[PDB]
Amino acid sequence: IEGRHMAPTENSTGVQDCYRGDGQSYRGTLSTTITGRTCQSWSSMTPHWHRRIPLYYPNAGLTRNYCRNPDAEIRPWCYTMDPSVRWEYCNLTRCPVTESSV
């Protein structure tokens, strides 16, 4: 989990940083994504329109810019603060330990 710049890439098999269990299971608290990007606080309208602000959706409970995803899958998928991305995967990757059955 977490890390610094080193891998010239990202998205699943692009950047380092391994996850555990369900990277997008309402966990993490890293508020980061990859090696120089965040989740973009859902409300900070400046670089890019994050998404349906806490007015249309049933106020689920987004942790500001805490790298995460609305529903689920395996890894989060939210924009970043860096005005040169608009989208990035949280610093979480398949670790060579945990497995998956269901």
From Swiss-Prot:
Protein family membership: Belongs to the peptidase S1 family. Plasminogen subfamily.
Disulfide bond sites: 18-95, 39-78, 67-90
Note, other: Apo(a) is known to be proteolytically cleaved, leading to the formation of the so-called mini-Lp(a). Apo(a) fragments accumulate in atherosclerotic lesions, where they may promote thrombogenesis. O-glycosylation may limit the extent of proteolytic fragmentation. Homology with plasminogen kringles IV and V is thought to underlie the atherogenicity of the protein, because the fragments are competing with plasminogen for fibrin(ogen) binding.
Record text on subunit structure and interactions: Disulfide-linked to apo-B100. Binds to fibronectin and decorin.
Gene designation per UniProt: LPA
Role according to the record: Apo(a) is the main constituent of lipoprotein(a) (Lp(a)). It has serine proteinase activity and is able of autoproteolysis. Inhibits tissue-type plasminogen activator 1. Lp(a) may be a ligand for megalin/Gp 330.
Post-translational modification: N- and O-glycosylated. The N-glycans are complex biantennary structures present in either a mono- or disialylated state. The O-glycans are mostly (80%) represented by the monosialylated core type I structure, NeuNAcalpha2-3Galbeta1-3GalNAc, with smaller amounts of disialylated and non-sialylated O-glycans also detected.
Residues of the full protein shown: 1377 to 1472 of 2040
Residues bearing carbohydrate: 11, 91
Annotated ranges, domain Kringle: 17-95
Record's protein name: Apolipoprotein(a)
Domain of life: Eukaryota
